[PDB]
């Protein structure tokens, strides 16, 4: 049978706090689905090789992991075994055709967005997007998207705090609002919109807690919030301690790193394999990714 290795930087590397979270996921859906046993081990980076060739020599024959984007590229050359890392192979990671990815990339969530929003009819949205960083990836993401979609540019604006005037007045001629946003701005804006107008975001949007603001917001996140009676995500016990949206989607990202393993270590390839995740609708992509497809929800 199916031993998996999960292979995850300790608690004192700066990811090693998202690591415990990813474990207890990984833990939760082993003991309700049975269908495998673990081996732990702490890696990254300097060790990330030697640690995977010591589970790999132990009988390991899939692993969960390495987290970080270095760790990533030192180990891709070493795989052996079905290996789900959790973050991107980046574009100097070596080719490989037993790495294969999950994550929460933030793209992923804009590509859709613009999705949903062209099957639901909305001819002439206004993008609408932030100075962050996350923020800038978003817009960049959904405005290729839409063009992608639609053959022409989607209407995009820099939000503007100290001057929302300009903003609004675009906004009024627009069938519905995207936000690529930081939640308090967000937040701010959707208090000055007309009542009525569409407005959509990712799950960006949704980080837990009273959030009366941006109530009627559209948006996409993962099953595990969503779908309460999804089939798998009701199996799965919630988490011990209330996350924030942002860890608990750490939590979630473990489930389905395990159920994908155990799917990986009894198939010929990654490229036939598909689960209904709690994190998503799964199914493999560009890069060995598995891409991940999202409900939508309303704040
Ligand atoms: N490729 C990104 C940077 C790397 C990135 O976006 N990584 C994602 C996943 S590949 C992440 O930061 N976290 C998701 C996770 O680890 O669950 C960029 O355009 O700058």
Do not use: C
């Not at 050359?77 to 055709?97: C, D, I």
């Not at 750490?250 to 489930?255: K, S, T, V």
């Amino acid at each position: 049978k199916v031993r998996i290795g999960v292979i995850l930087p300790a608690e004192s590397s700066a990811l090693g706090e998202a690591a415990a979270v990813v474990r207890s996921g990984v833990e939760a859906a082993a003991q309700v689905d049975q269908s495998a046993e673990l081996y732990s081990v702490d890696a990254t980076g300097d060790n990330v090789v030697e640690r995977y060739r010591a589970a790999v020599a132990d009988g390991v024959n899939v692993v969960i992991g390495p987290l970080s984007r270095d760790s990533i590229v030192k180990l891709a050359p070493s795989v052996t075994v079905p290996t789900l890392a959790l973050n991107s192979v980046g574009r100097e990671a070596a080719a490989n055709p037993k790495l294969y990815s999950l994550s929460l990339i933030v793209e992923g969530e804009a590509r859709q967005l613009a999705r949903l929003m062209r099957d639901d009819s909305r001819a002439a949205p206004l993008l609408v997007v932030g100075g962050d960083a996350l923020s800038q990836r978003l817009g960049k993401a959904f405005a290729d998207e839409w063009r992608a979609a639609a053959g022409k540019p989607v209407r995009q604006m820099a939000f503007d705090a100290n001057d929302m005037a300009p903003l609004l007045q675009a906004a009024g001629q627009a069938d519905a609002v995207a936000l690529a946003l930081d939640v308090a701005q967000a937040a701010r804006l959707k208090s000055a919109l007309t009542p009525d107008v569409p407005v959509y975001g990712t799950s960006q949007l949704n980080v837990g807690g009273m959030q009366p603001e941006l109530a009627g917001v559209r948006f996409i996140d993962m099953p595990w919030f969503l779908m309460p009676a999804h089939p798998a995500v009701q199996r799965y016990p919630r988490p011990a301690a209330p996350l924030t949206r942002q860890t608990e989607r750490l939590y979630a990202l473990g489930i389905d790193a395990y159920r994908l393993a155990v799917q990986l270590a009894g198939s010929r390839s990654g490229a036939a394999v598909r689960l209904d995740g709690v994190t998503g609708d799964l199914k493999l992509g560009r890069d060995r990714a598995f891409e991940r497809q999202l409900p939508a929800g309303v704040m």
